[PDB]
Amino acid sequence: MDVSILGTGLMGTALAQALIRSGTKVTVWNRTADRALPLAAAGATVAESPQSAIAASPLIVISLLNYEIAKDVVTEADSIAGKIIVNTATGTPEEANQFAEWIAGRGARYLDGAIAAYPEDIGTESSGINYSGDEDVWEDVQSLLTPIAAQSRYVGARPGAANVIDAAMAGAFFNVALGAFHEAAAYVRSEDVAIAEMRHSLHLWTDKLLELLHEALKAFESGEYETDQATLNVYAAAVEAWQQSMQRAGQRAALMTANLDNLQRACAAGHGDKGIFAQIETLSAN
Amino acid sequence: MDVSILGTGLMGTALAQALIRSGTKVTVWNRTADRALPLAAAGATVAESPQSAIAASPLIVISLLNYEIAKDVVTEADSIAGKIIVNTATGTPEEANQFAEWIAGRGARYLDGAIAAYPEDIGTESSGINYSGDEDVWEDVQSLLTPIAAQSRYVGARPGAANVIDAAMAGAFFNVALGAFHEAAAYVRSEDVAIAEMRHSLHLWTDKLLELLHEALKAFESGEYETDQATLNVYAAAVEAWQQSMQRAGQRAALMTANLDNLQRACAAGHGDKGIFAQIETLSAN
Known part of the structure; x- marks a missing residue:
């Protein structure tokens, strides 16, 4: 089974790169366009349009700025039916539930995604992706997708679920924690203690x-x-x-x-x- | 060189235990009293009083609730002179600076301490202690003290410095971070997403x-x-x-x-x- 990636903005590229070395036919597409040039050299068919991209493969991994854009990009396909759409955009659970219900209604299968990793991390041990939605779908793409991250986990039947947890982990927890350390190190510097000794x-x-x-x-x-x-x-x-x-x-x-x-x-x-x-x-x- | 520990309240005990297996004569003392009984069985002289404890050894590691108590306990010594006092109480830098100036004025040497570790951690890799104050002192006790923690670091000439960093790391950073995760997991539970999938x-x-x-x-x-x-x-x-x-x-x-x-x-x-x-x-x- 082969795959098309809509979006090459560092992540999508990394996603692609990983999928090719995993042993899969890959077909890319980018609205920014030139940015997908290199992927060809790796070994990936580039594509005139969304339509041709969608058409090339049964599994479509979206990798675009937000949901608004991804909505607009797969509006241009005419038929998306019997295809698997795997959208790895960060956003609200609401956004994920609307978009899932939409894909379902154009006779397509859906799985919402959320990526805990820097682009560079994607091949390596330091990488995880969560998915939520129809578990039937995740069962049909596990083998094709697990290879691109060290940890890959179906986290629930609610489409919005991978987005809730990514909010929780990256925002509620991670970002706040990273601020806490700013408060910390500012305190240490204000007592004319050397910040280095916290290393x-x-x-x-x-x-x-x-x-x-x-x-x-x-x-x-x-x-x-x-x-x-x-x-x-x-x-x-x-x-x-x-x-x-x-x-x-x-x-x-x-x-x-x-x-x-x-x-x-x-x-x-x-x-x-x-x-x-x-x-x-x-x-x-x- | 031999050492006396004032305080056996889990930490002090752990401190002691580590020092004996390191290869050192150890002498303990506890105001709660009975709680130091076991240490004897390990191989540690227990002691009637503070006075005898202080007197037994040239290096005194304090391990008592707070600074108020440690002030009160070494007030009872009459002469503490030419001794090394190493106080591992958590507190303000002010508290540490007052207490250092006091020890100095009874002809004793000082080093203020701060312990990043659970009692059980003390022998093992998962343990660190910071010290600050006269660096001459730390130079004279490094060999005797480094063994009881995986990481042991002199963090500056300001006595209050180990307390600033312990505040920063355990309070400003650590505790806040641990709260952030509460906010996180509460959010996840409120979206009827399973908290387990954050594991x-x-x-x-x-x-x-x-x-x-x-x-x-x-x-x-x-x-x-x-x-x-x-x-x-x-x-x-x-x-x-x-x-x-x-x-x-x-x-x-x-x-x-x-x-x-x-x-x-x-x-x-x-x-x-x-x-x-x-x-x-x-x-x-x-």
């Missing part, structure tokens, strides 16, 4: 965070926030003290305040004596 | 975060926030969209709002077109 500990802390993440997950699946050691109250105190120390250093410490606030709410709603994982119970705006 | 990606994301941390660090040392790809503006948009999506799901998304706020300030102060590492320039309360 050797980085991997200890990320190693520690990972463990705890797994543990938080366990405690979210279970109801069990059994105290065990350091309680909500303990943490609210420690963080208040850190906030203050950060504030006195002349740092808005906004992430910390938000962390504190989250933690106090958990205590004030009477979770003060459970484990930290119980701060989850008070994150609804209510 | 396999965890180590990819923590692996990614580590790299970026190193990179942020590079860009903080350098002035160089050269754009290179995704700009402040790009990120402010993505995060606003994520916030909204999280909000619409009925989530206070406070960490995200704070992250957004941090990011907008950076743009409004005209960094919109540099790399994300430039959000640091706008964290002062100003």
Whole structure:
């Protein structure tokens, strides 16, 4: 089974490159056009149009800026029927559900995608893609798609699901975490301590965070926030003290305040004596 | 050279245990008292009092609740002179600077400590301790202390420095990051997506975060926030969209709002077109 990629903007290219070395006939197409030139040299048919691209292959992997564009690009096909559309655009679950219902109604199969990886990562161990939607579909493309990422996982029948998790992981968690470290290093610099001396500990802390993440997950699946050691109250105190120390250093410490606030709410709603994982119970705006 | 540990409350014990297997004479003491019983069985002289503990050995590693207690415990020694005091209590830099100046004035040498590790971690690879203060001292105890942690680093002549970084790393960064993931997983659960499907990606994301941390660090040392790809503006948009999506799901998304706020300030102060590492320039309360 052969595949066509709509979009060559670094990712799509990487996607393509991986698929060719995996052992598959590949056909590309790009609205920017010239940017797909190199792919030919690799070993990929380029294509006049969307229409010819769609027509070339039974599996179509979209790789375009957003959903609006991908809607517009496969509007130009006339018939997309009996084809598999695999859209790896990041966006809302709503966007993914609308677009899935649309593909379904032009007699096409769908699978929504979300890519945890830098373009350069795609061949290698440091790469993961999640998919959601008709599981029948994922079953029919696993073998063809798993090769291009180290980790490839069907994460649920809701089309919007890979987008929820990509939001959660890349936004809610990842980006905030990356800001937290800015607050951190700014504090360290404001105490005229050398920021460099935070270098050797980085991997200890990320190693520690990972463990705890797994543990938080366990405690979210279970109801069990059994105290065990350091309680909500303990943490609210420690963080208040850190906030203050950060504030006195002349740092808005906004992430910390938000962390504190989250933690106090958990205590004030009477979770003060459970484990930290119980701060989850008070994150609804209510 | 031999050592005495004041405090056996899990950590101190672990500290002790490690020091004995390293090949050192060890002498313990505990105010809770009974809790030091087992250490004897390992191979450690227990001690009537602080005074006898201090007196037993030239190097004294304190391991007590806070600084107030450690002040009170070595007030009871009469003479602490020509001894090395190594205090591994977490606290403010101020607390560390007061206490260092005090030890210095009873003719004793000081080194302030901060422990990135769970008690159980102490023997093993997953362990680090930072020290700050007179570097002459650290030079005289490196060989005796490095064995008990995988990573042991003198992080500056400011006594308060190990406490600044432990605040930064464990509070500003670590704890906030652990909250961010609560916001994350709460969002995922609120879209009736299964929280379990965030398990396999965890180590990819923590692996990614580590790299970026190193990179942020590079860009903080350098002035160089050269754009290179995704700009402040790009990120402010993505995060606003994520916030909204999280909000619409009925989530206070406070960490995200704070992250957004941090990011907008950076743009409004005209960094919109540099790399994300430039959000640091706008964290002062100003």
